[PDB]
Design a protein around this ligand. Sequence first.
Ligand SMILES: Nc1ncnc2c1ncn2[C@@H]1O[C@H](COP(=O)(O)OP(=O)(O)O)[C@@H](O)[C@H]1O
Ligand SMILES: Nc1ncnc2c1ncn2[C@@H]1O[C@H](COP(=O)(O)OP(=O)(O)O)[C@@H](O)[C@H]1O
Lengths: 365, 365
Amino acid sequence: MKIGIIGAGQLARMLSLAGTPLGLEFHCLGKNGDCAEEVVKTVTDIELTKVNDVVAWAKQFDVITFENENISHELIKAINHEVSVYPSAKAIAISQDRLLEKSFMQDHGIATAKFVNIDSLAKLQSAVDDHGLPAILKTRRFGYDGKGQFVIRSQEDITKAWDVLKDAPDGLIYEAFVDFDYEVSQICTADLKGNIAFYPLARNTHKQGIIVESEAPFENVVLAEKAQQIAKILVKEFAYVGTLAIEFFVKGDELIVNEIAPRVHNSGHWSIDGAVTSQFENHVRAIAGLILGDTTSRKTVMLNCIGGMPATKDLAALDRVKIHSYNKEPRKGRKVGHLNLNLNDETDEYQLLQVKKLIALSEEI
Amino acid sequence: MKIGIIGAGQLARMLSLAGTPLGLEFHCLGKNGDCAEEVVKTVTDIELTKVNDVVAWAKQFDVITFENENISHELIKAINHEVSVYPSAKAIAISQDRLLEKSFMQDHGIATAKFVNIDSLAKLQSAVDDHGLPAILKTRRFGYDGKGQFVIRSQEDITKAWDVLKDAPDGLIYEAFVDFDYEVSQICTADLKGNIAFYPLARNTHKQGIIVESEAPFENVVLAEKAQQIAKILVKEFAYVGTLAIEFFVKGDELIVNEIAPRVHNSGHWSIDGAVTSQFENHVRAIAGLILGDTTSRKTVMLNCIGGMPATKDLAALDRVKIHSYNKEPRKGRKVGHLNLNLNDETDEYQLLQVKKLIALSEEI
Ligand SMILES: Nc1ncnc2c1ncn2[C@@H]1O[C@H](COP(=O)(O)OP(=O)(O)O)[C@@H](O)[C@H]1O
Ligand SMILES: Nc1ncnc2c1ncn2[C@@H]1O[C@H](COP(=O)(O)OP(=O)(O)O)[C@@H](O)[C@H]1O
């Protein structure tokens, strides 16, 4: 069976690394030199605006998936008409737009931050009057790792935020600042029949809008049950197939949905070395019509390499650390790799302190 | 760093799968369509007899290794003159010839089967007179999985074995039949400085000359210490760098060396899902000048897929089995994949019985 992936980034790279031992053949749509090229059969550079050429490319394979949900859902709708695409176009359209995303949660009694669609300066002032400060003005589409946003701390920032983002295509959205204690994420995989394989919750640490550390399992039976019930709602309403990610705010014993990602997620990279079946192999198993793998997990921490990465010779000296270099070009703010480590004894805690000092010397956010 | 591998088979395929997350770039010498092609950067088809063209190919990369020890050690000697090759040419020359292999063991007080070089029919009769029957006449070079041999059960088989193999290039060798209870293998990795990372012993099961099942760890402190001391001798005498494999016969509490393989070995495929660092990643770490990874292991069984492989849909139903299809063309006697499974509880034993019944329906030896 041949699997086509829209995008040739690190997520497609690790999808192929996990799925290739299953006997599957992988092909990517992307530019030559992208980090997935050396682990996939072919890479084809086609502008996504040429819908007919993308469909003709997709029809060479048995199933299509994607690594970036910001692509046109009409393109996915056109591809899915002739070759199956997972997950669905409905999951893309709702996930790629913050307004539609939070409107969906509200329509299903799922708690999120207070949000208002922003289409004028007066609409922004009314949202600040109703739901207070601090707050954040975000673009509805595109923008990642905090880019394309303006935090409103005072009344003077209202007109400044509007001036920057007023002409952003596809609109803006107001978000009230959430009083939360910490952040967790729920990652799961749904097969063709709707069966869901759940991973334990992962507590995630952000640094300037980017995720830098993820630790699993996060033990909380109350929060885990509510997160799974939220995931079951999304899987059913989306007719979802593949790996799904939901990021939460935690305030007390109550969960607040931040955003969802209809794909394998950064907060699940721990599962490569922490679970019997990683989020990547199970996403591959899901879209290929296979039964999902067992997801029994052990305590492990993931550390992101942003901007730069410690020397492989320095990382290899900590012989328990599992190295996952993406072979990407180093650039400030860019995710170039991550590091996993099972935490069992004090030797694990010792190597964990040394690898964090290495990251601090190479990290550029 | 760029790593060149002579050969593009399943061993090179899994070397690249294990080393690519380390940030390393892999290139193979082999035919297009070999199963390592889709996971390596490039594959180049060069006849190994064209020594100058192979050296020019190898000089594009930072270090060279190989997956088949039956290649010319003079070729490796020529390549190593201009770009480092691991393991050494001395390890190749001794391992690739059964006579030189057993003569080496005898020169270091290492027990093997009784062996005599065979260069005439009278020499074979004298070996049978001295060391009895049953016995096996083998080619010194080439021939694998039992091919190119003739078992001598009676006096009538002496002239029959000689007639078949007399004109075999590079000679023949007599071997006395070993009275052994079972078979184990010792796999280890030596870095550039001579440090050895040891894996636990693996008990291996053969079926008609081919290995079909490997289980680790095999608990025997007495046999394990002797196997490690034998490995240390080979690593030092060979100036060895990389993963090394030694297969033993076991009769009581004493080890009898069967053969050695200067490479990653079939009896170590369990380490992909059983060890913190598999034999493949550690072979890559060794030749790349990196510090080896921790080799803490858990109980796991490997089952070989020979001739055919069970349907991926059938294998995926046993969600704890780790699937390793080589994406090779099915043919009687050919290794097309293997399956690993951690053994912890009775659910593991249950899925183990079901996967063995699947293999019996697809296996063709
Ligand atoms: N409404 C909010 N209230 C408080 N913090 C927020 C809010 N929205 C985002 N954040 C912060 O930003 C991080 C996530 O950024 P996000 O909005 O997901 O960026 P993007 O969606 O562009 O990837 C979170 O870890 C959180 O700390
Ligand atoms: N001298 C011997 N005595 C008993 N059994 C042997 C002997 N040599 C090989 N065998 C059998 O053959 C198997 C290994 O085959 P081998 O000789 O290694 O083939 P090749 O070297 O061509 O791969 C072993 O599992 C063992 O059962």
